[PDB]
Structure formats: C-alpha cells, structure tokens
Design a protein around this ligand. Sequence first.
Ligand code: NAG
Ligand code: CA
Lengths: 133, 131, 133
Amino acid sequence: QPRPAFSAIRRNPPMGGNVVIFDTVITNQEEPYQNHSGRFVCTVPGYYYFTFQVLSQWEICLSIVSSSRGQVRRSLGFCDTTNKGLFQVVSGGMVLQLQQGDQVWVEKDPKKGHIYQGSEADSVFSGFLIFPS
Amino acid sequence: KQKFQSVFTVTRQTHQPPAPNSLIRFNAVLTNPQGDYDTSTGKFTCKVPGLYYFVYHASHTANLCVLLYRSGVKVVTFCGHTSKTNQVNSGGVLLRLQVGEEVWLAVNDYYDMVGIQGSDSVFSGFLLFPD
Amino acid sequence: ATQKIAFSATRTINVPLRRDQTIRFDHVITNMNNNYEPRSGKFTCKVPGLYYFTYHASSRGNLCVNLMRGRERAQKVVTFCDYAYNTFQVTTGGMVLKLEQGENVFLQATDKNSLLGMEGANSIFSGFLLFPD
Ligand SMILES: CC(=O)N[C@@H]1[C@@H](O)[C@H](O)[C@@H](CO)O[C@H]1O
Ligand SMILES: [Ca+2]
C-alpha cells in the first residue's frame, strides 16, 4: 500500500543555486526526498500536499516548484519582506497532482533569499500523499 | 475513484483586496477535481462526508484578519499586522463535516490581501477520513 | 478509512507561560479517537504510523516554541521562532513524524513566550494520521 511522506530541516545545507536544500531528514517514508539536492521525487502518482515554514531575518521570497519530464513548472510564491533583522517565518503550501518521476522542490528569489542559518531555530519542508490517482 | 475523494487548492488572482467584513473569494484553481470549491460563490460545499483539513496562506501588506466559517459559524480567526512590507497570514483546522455543509474564509475590518510581486494567497482543503 | 485519528484544539488560557512548560490547548474543536488530551496539551500515539502535526499561534511579541517528541522523557524535534516588535503576528510550524505507540507529541514554551489565545486571535494545535503502520 502506497505511504510517501517526508519532513526535512536545515542545519548543514550545501549552498548554491536558488534551490533551497533541507539537508537534515526527520522523516522520509518511502525515501521520496533527496537531502543532497532538496528534491522530492514522486514514485506513487496522485494528489500530494506540500508545505514549508522557513525562517528569515531580512527579505525572503520562496516558491514551491515542480517538474515533469524535466520541464520546470513554476508556481505560487510566498514572501516576508519585514527586513528588520528579526526572526520572521514565511510559509506556504499547496496540493499538487503528480505523475511518476515528477520532482518537487523549494526555490528562492535570487533577489530576496535570506534564510537564517544557525542553531536557535529551524526551517522545515514537508510533503505527503493525500490519495493516489 | 475520483468522486469518492475531495481536494482543492484555489488562489486569489487579483490586485484589489476583499471588501471589509466579507467572504473572501478565491477565483483561480490550482486543483479542484470534484468541484467542491466553487469559485463563483467563494464557498466549499461538502459532497463526501468525513474528516477534512483546511489550511490557507494569505499574503498582505497592511493589516489582515482571516476568519474561517463552517455552516454560518466562525471557527477560527488569525490576524497579522504590518505596514507596507509583506508577510504571510496562515491558519488551519480539522473538521468532521456532513453532506451539504459549507466552509469559507472571510475578513473583518482588517481586510488587506495585497501581496507584493511574487507573494500570493492560497486556500486548501482535503478529505482525510471518509464516512 | 478505519483507524480515524485527528485532533484540533485551541488555547483559551491567558496565563503567561514559563520556560519548559507544556503548552496546553484546552478547547477541542476536533478529537477523533481521543488521542489528544486537552488537560495537558499532549498527543499520545495509540496506533503506530505517520502523522502530520501543525500549529498556528497568535502573538504580540517574541515567540519560540519547541516541538517535543518522546515517551516519559521527551526530546525536542525542532524549535520555531517568530519575532514581533509592538505588533500582532500569526506564526506557524508543521512536521511529519513516524510515531510508535506510547509516544507523545506536544508543544513546549521557551524564554520567548508571547502567545495569545482568544476571540479574534486564536492559537491552535492539530495533528492527524496519514498512514497506519
Ligand atoms: C549534507 C548532505 O546533504 N548530506 C547528508 C549526509 O551527511 C547524511 O549522512 C545523510 C543521511 O540521511 O543525509 C544527507 O543529507
Ligand atoms: Ca513575526
């Protein structure tokens, strides 16, 4: 019976590019999430929920992006631009209908991409199958 | 079988915010296969009875309170205050619904839903446990 | 389906939290299978499996919360911080966890304890079973 479900957080993330990599795995049932790349890979086709709560101190715009057959599919964004140097949590989430092999990841705005790095608090990326199609 | 499930993600695609003290219409669909969210009324209507999760993330650059309503009763309110910078107001709740029950989001006197470029507003709901 | 486990509970108590105190959400909106205890604020797993836990908290100042997991002695999974100078905020966090029977999950206050629970600015704690073991 289909289980795919993950949660991943940031602590020692490889930095580079606009993809937000959450390097520390908390849950990875069916191992759909790749912690080296920050990419979720769909094995079971169906409707999935994805959500993130990401800590910033300055400006941050994030988007849940997907791909099918390697073609990138941009989507909605979510921002906190308080820009006062104090913890703010930006969040977003959506249902995505995915086909086998589809990939899903968080991408930042190259002009607004501050993500807190440290041990005081956490940023999280999660996803789970709602029902197979 | 698709009609034995329930799921939607709708979004608000417009630059003008809702009127004060009004139901919030999400006019654009990301997914809504059973048609359970109605973009013309702004209301979700229960087709399949059971336990649902509802959650939203709304961008705003002035004060915003979002109220979630179930069959005429306000279930939860969450407010975010800001002045000219962008934040996300979020809220969510699990509810066991009967056929024909309506769910929707509304604002009060704090009604701003004007996100900066690249910051949107979303409302999702899905059936977890049928009966 | 069969194993229907889901809870949503709000906080209506306006008494200031102390560090390390379990955050009680005393008003249940939903509590199917009654695995959530509104008297303590803890969820206690009966049926092993994948759960998703989430909260939204209103605040009028700096707030940090620990998401705790464990049996008789609990360990923190993550800490979420959201700061606010002189302004009302709503913050959020979530996490997918694979739980054993007897494991409890709850939110715990820190230093940073500005949290409101009232009419017009609620705080809520929810969780549900994704997939049984
Ligand atoms: C930094 C990175 O991406 N690599 C880690 C690796 O150190 C760890 O052993 C593995 C186990 O889950 O998880 C990876 O994400
Ligand atoms: Ca804040």
